[PDB]
Amino acid sequence: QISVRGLAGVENVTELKKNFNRHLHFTLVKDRNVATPRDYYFALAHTVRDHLVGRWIRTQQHYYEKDPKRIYYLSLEFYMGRTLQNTMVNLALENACDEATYQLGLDMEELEEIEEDAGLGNGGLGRLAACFLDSMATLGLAAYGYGIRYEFGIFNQKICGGWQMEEADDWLRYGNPWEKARPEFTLPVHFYGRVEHTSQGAKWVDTQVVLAMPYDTPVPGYRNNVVNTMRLWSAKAPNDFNLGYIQAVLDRNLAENISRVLYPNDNFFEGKELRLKQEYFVVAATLQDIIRRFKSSTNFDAFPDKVAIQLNDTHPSLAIPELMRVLVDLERLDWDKAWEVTVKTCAYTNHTVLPEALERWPVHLLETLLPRHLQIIYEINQRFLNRVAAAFPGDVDRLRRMSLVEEGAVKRINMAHLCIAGSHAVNGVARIHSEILKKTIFKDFYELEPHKFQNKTNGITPRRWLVLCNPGLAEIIAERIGEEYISDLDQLRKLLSYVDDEAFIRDVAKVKQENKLKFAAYLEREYKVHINPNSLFDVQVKRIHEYKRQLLNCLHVITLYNRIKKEPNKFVVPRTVMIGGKAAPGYHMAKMIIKLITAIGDVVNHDPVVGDRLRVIFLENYRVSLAEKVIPAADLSEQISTAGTEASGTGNMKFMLNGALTIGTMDGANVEMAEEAGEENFFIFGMRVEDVDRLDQRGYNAQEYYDRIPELRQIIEQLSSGFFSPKQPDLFKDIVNMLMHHDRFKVFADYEEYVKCQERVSALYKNPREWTRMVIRNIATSGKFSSDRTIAQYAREIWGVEPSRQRLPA
Amino acid sequence: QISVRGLAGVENVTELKKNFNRHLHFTLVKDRNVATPRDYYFALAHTVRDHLVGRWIRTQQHYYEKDPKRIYYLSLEFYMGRTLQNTMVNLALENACDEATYQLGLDMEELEEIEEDAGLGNGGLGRLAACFLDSMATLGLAAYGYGIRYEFGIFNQKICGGWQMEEADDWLRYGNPWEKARPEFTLPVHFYGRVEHTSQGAKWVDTQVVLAMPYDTPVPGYRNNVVNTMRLWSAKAPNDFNLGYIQAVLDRNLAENISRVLYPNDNFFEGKELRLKQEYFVVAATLQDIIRRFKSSTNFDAFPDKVAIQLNDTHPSLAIPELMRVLVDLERLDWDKAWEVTVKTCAYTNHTVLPEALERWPVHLLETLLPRHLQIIYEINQRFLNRVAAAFPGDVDRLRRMSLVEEGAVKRINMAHLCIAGSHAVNGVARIHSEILKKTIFKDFYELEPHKFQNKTNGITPRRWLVLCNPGLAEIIAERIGEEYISDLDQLRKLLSYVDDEAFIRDVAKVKQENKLKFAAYLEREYKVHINPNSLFDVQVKRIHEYKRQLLNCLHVITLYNRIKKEPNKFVVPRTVMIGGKAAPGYHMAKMIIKLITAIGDVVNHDPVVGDRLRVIFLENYRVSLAEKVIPAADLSEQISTAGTEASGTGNMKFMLNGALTIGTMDGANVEMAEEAGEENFFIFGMRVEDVDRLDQRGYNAQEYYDRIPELRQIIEQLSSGFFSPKQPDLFKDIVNMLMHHDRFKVFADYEEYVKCQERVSALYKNPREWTRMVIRNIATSGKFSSDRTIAQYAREIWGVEPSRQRLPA
Numbered sequence A, B: 001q002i003s004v005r006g007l008a009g010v011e012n013v014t015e016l017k018k019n020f021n022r023h024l025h026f027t028l029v030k031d032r033n034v035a036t037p038r039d040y041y042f043a044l045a046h047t048v049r050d051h052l053v054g055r056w057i058r059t060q061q062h063y064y065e066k067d068p069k070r071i072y073y074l075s076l077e078f079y080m081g082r083t084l085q086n087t088m089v090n091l092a093l094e095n096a097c098d099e100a101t102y103q104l105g106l107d108m109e110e111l112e113e114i115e116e117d118a119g120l121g122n123g124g125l126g127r128l129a130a131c132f133l134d135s136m137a138t139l140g141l142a143a144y145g146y147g148i149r150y151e152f153g154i155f156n157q158k159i160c161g162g163w164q165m166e167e168a169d170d171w172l173r174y175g176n177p178w179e180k181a182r183p184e185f186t187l188p189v190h191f192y193g194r195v196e197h198t199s200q201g202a203k204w205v206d207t208q209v210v211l212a213m214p215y216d217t218p219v220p221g222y223r224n225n226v227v228n229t230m231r232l233w234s235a236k237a238p239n240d241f242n243l244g245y246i247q248a249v250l251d252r253n254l255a256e257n258i259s260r261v262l263y264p265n266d267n268f269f270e271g272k273e274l275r276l277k278q279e280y281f282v283v284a285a286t287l288q289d290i291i292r293r294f295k296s297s298t299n300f301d302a303f304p305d306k307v308a309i310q311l312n313d314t315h316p317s318l319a320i321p322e323l324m325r326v327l328v329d330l331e332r333l334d335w336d337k338a339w340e341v342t343v344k345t346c347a348y349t350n351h352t353v354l355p356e357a358l359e360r361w362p363v364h365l366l367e368t369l370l371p372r373h374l375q376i377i378y379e380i381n382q383r384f385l386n387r388v389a390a391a392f393p394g395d396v397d398r399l400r401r402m403s404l405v406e407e408g409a410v411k412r413i414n415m416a417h418l419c420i421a422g423s424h425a426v427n428g429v430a431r432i433h434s435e436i437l438k439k440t441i442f443k444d445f446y447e448l449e450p451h452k453f454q455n456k457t458n459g460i461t462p463r464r465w466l467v468l469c470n471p472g473l474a475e476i477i478a479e480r481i482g483e484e485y486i487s488d489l490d491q492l493r494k495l496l497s498y499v500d501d502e503a504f505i506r507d508v509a510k511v512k513q514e515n516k517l518k519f520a521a522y523l524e525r526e527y528k529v530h531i532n533p534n535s536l537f538d539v540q541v542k543r544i545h546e547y548k549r550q551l552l553n554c555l556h557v558i559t560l561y562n563r564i565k566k567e568p569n570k571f572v573v574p575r576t577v578m579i580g581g582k583a584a585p586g587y588h589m590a591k592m593i594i595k596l597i598t599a600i601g602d603v604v605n606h607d608p609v610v611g612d613r614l615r616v617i618f619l620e621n622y623r624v625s626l627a628e629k630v631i632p633a634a635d636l637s638e639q640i641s642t643a644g645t646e647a648s649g650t651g652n653m654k655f656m657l658n659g660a661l662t663i664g665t666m667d668g669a670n671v672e673m674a675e676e677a678g679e680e681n682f683f684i685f686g687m688r689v690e691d692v693d694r695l696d697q698r699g700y701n702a703q704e705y706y707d708r709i710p711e712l713r714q715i716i717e718q719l720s721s722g723f724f725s726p727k728q729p730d731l732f733k734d735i736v737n738m739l740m741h742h743d744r745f746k747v748f749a750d751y752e753e754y755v756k757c758q759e760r761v762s763a764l765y766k767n768p769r770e771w772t773r774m775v776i777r778n779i780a781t782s783g784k785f786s787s788d789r790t791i792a793q794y795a796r797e798i799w800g801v802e803p804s805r806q807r808l809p810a
């Protein structure tokens, strides 16, 4: 049908059809009389997988012979989503499979919807890891993603009576055709025990052993025949575990609980022992595997020439002392040489400045679970503080501020400080965030070791986030400038010469409308909800957090409603306001925010005077596959975090690439987006980081805003009195109290400028041609925000490897 | 190589080689550079499986179109063993695959050893179920095995310091290529709750739901292209189970523990709640599935014309009240019609008379777990006792003896009584056992309903137990009489005309010696133990139990040792005494018996005066795959249970088919074996059932034997004083005390006749030609003990179906 989806040749379509029938018969044990739609999805998955594995084996052979420097990306989260369409896109198979399945009497898009998301992440951090794997393979780097194969990923969210309900995400129920178990690489991991000191150094003895069994998933580059590996570890009890008999067998679950479930916290630290066991489990098994592979290539001087380890946040921070443990205790290297190797091998990426997200583990936990690692951490700390003391003599307070050990009620280990000391590079994820790191939280560390600090602005993969989810837009672009931009997103600048092109303007607006019609239909089918496809699609999708300020959005929605009620026969640009995202199960305030949203919807959506001029919808179960649907249908992207709180954002970049305009604060990567596109092509409002600091020094008083803004006052009174909760008038008392007396994120302070800025958006939308021209200017300047650019910078400036766009033979 | 293993044609070998290479590459993602031996086994397994599935789909199509009466074999145990070789044998593929793998540079026998046993059974009862599935498919019956997919089967036994140690049998670690998950047939099973009475009958409400997910395994008939289905249920928690969040997810294990582990008790009842949950789980899911399939063929009058349910022991006895529950509570049939259907549908096979093996569930357990089923059982009991009262008026004690409810300290339900009342047929498993049922334990029931009681003597499948494990013997037989006997074992009688044939005599003895040499080599390779292959192979393999009297064997071994020590330079027929079998983990006395055996071995095997005239070996980890090795190498089969205790035995039949002679008591199927072969061709000794009864009435006094038999006295003194345990002189005090004061199985009473009979065995073995002629007379008369005969009798006399040896088209 469309060009970017590849060729549908006679030979290929015929071959695909027969392999599909072979898998249906031999693999699935079905025929066309008894096959379920799920059987048809699996037959297709297995057919496409056949094309992957040939390239998989020769990629691993290639790396084995060439022996390049290997990149190890360590993450507790890989937010992968669905695999089928992505694989077809990167193998140029999509049109062929579409034709082949059509000829078999099947709809391929219907089959695609049967695949479960691999939801092994919470939000931005986990999805970044997934975009990274894609870019590393597309750029021909010998890279491996290492994580945990959670049995249950992020929970499925159901909305019941307006409340979030959680259910288990049993994503492996029907099986995963993409993974391959590798029990020959099963490795022991140790916990508890104690430390013995002998003539020849320390020994960690009397430990409980848990086995780590790897499962490999292929990661295909874009049309270069490169297929990299993501290795995920599963926890297994040894066969003599606890070995009355029956109970001993049932208690195996205790060891195997390590890989059972993903902690559903986004940007929030929860200091639970099971979480620590997960962090050590992935680190211990991975490092053993890395070393095995290095040895099967004695000389550890060359270790950093052949290995790079990237730590995605502090979650895998135990890699630093674990590498020291292995080098010192097992390999018998002296401390100083082991440390040189460790530092040169490791690098650390910081994802947030929020204090509640920082990992600070109680010493008593590490003392019981990992007694040897505590000793190593203490020794790392001693030697590090000796260097600080020599550089800044007499500065006793610096010493206490930089210590990896925090004193107080309970002693804690600061894992960020451990990471900085043990890494040769530390990076933030957007320019403003990286500057904040040098100026505030890691200022002392930057003064000691300035060379260590870098910026690597985040990116997203244009394969999943353009070609896959928005084929219509990728096609009208390729008609003008060709296909090369897909793996070289900077080429989108060539679209600037089409900003006055009336044909192109018409096509861009046409693609958007098609996307909006298709999403409006999806809502009626799956969720029985009616919306006007001619209204402005106003969308905020991301995890529910106070710092992301879904509440600010709520205040605007209510403002519009009250304005309509006051002047009903006055014209307003119609809007569909869509808000979606999951709240962490223990995050009470985030759960109340969801309830507020739906409660606003209950009043707004059923007021006869409003009509179809304003609709408020909560998008249930927001996840990667839903993002692929809603993002291409958006007109307006809400990126409204308080300045200084969102380290980067990546959802923002997804919306920019797909033809939505942005309303946002000068925060995270919004700053660089506005810089690329030009400030006039962006809807910027609110306090800058500097204004927030000014307000903090003065003291934030929310009452002042309530007293001076009558419209804001009306909203607070509506909330307090029970306008949005008739049967439970005090339902939202926690929200009001928080807004009035302890709002860390200054919602009221940005209200006036937000409402005013929203008016400017409505004004532009009234002029379709000028809306679309501004859109074209955004799409055309989004090239910087490709993760191919991000990864190339990591490769050159951190890992010391050169990327390659050169094909491997098919 | 050998004829019975089928044709190795040019077209077939070429096709097998390319599919093997296809699976290695595409399925396993390997090439010849990186493949492990385990990868090679899996490539072969997947290649052979391809040939199965085609026949599988058309067998299920056949049954769907013809709509025959379906046989449902309900068992908590299916002791299947390995599947690869069995599949090749039944598909006539063995020689072809042997050639194909040879040409690829691989040894097929080495690959076969990599497959894990499916050890989902304890002993005789579970292995019978497996032989039955094989015969039902070979005889073209539309039969389904229904059970539980245990994650851990019977434990792997390790012998450490002479003691049994247990380890988890993680048989699914590497995956099972034979099974197919069928999540479209996932069914809810209910537990706990309470009973509500409405206008329209009772309702079972407020229940905990556990999901049952089926896994199907193919069961191929012998060269008839019939492939039946074994469906095994796996326990799954629903996705909203217990839905802080993390703990709720981790607690899913509570529901899923139902299918976790097989209870390792052989002929012993353990009244634990988890075991009851297993029994209900398999019954509830199966009956729902049976009914679904019946409806997808309203009219339940015809239900018994289309369905037979066979209960393997009382383990699935809850099928009776569950069928009543479904028919009465859900389908709204009146009690009397529901009951007529139930009785006509169900039949019950009893496997033992031992009181400690009988299932008697505490009423308080059923009251909490299954409140509705208790009500139904009480109502079944009331109506049943009303019939007894009418048939035997005034006989108040009969009423209490026949009641399904047992009174006392704790009220219990007698599940055997439930089975008899709710079944149209009740059978024992050998003629003597069936007579004992009518005369003793079920005498009252037989007087009420004589027509209900039948015999169905057990059998074994000649495919696994001759062709597969003893190809050498199957081949010399086929040379004389053809191949037809393999599915018609009676034809073995034709071998009687070869008893004086000097060529045949030589070949039989040649096959045995080859088997003994191969097993002697297996012992040195896998267990580093040296044995003389020219000695008489004296073997007792079976579960360790007091009733099976491994202890009697031990007394004989010690007698031989003491006789050698007394007269060292006197000639004795050399023996290798092999004893093997698992003890239930909580069975203390069985564990002591194992320790005694190894302790005897420690003394005997290292006495220089003994030499290679006597060796005592404990065969570790006895299981189906080990049975396939040791049985063809045996000269002497020990079948020495106290008369009246072993209901049938099946190991006895395995040894008879494979050219070993039998020393045994007139117990179980030994009686019919001796009858078939002729008493002169069997080594019979000891008390008959009648002699045991005489001794019981008089009072068994072990002291009498100790006082009158000096040799027996010496052994007891050796045991007591510490001759076999120097460092722990009192180690075997429990055994001696049991033998002297509370031996339920009268070991001393059969000692004299046993030793004397053993002398007659040694005498015959001195004359190879006459030994072999007696062997030929055993093999030639073993035809009755084919499970094809057993199943044909079940089919005609219980299930009301006609077997068919007619091929389906390939």
Ligand SMILES: O=C(O)C[C@H](OC(=O)/C=C/c1ccc(O)cc1)[C@@H](OC(=O)/C=C/c1ccc(O)cc1)C(=O)O
Pocket (backbone or CB within 6 Å): A057, A060, A061, A064, A185, A216, A229, A293, B031, B033, B034
């Ligand atoms: O990168 C991955 O996805 C997994 C690694 O795979 C490989 O390195 C495979 C190398 C290879 C593949 C195919 C060949 O024909 C030669 C070498 C795996 O390594 C191996 O499995 C290596 C196997 C092997 C290589 C060479 C040899 O002589 C024997 C076995 C690992 O380190 O986990």
Ligand SMILES: O=C(O)C[C@H](OC(=O)/C=C/c1ccc(O)cc1)[C@@H](OC(=O)/C=C/c1ccc(O)cc1)C(=O)O
Pocket (backbone or CB within 6 Å): A031, A033, A034, B057, B060, B061, B064, B185, B216, B229, B293
């Ligand atoms: O016996 C088994 O091993 C499983 C049963 O399989 C079958 O009965 C299959 C029947 C069949 C197989 C192939 C055909 O072309 C037609 C019918 C299965 O039944 C089905 O899956 C039936 C599927 C089906 C039959 C007819 C129809 O029109 C739709 C679906 C069951 O009852 O568990």
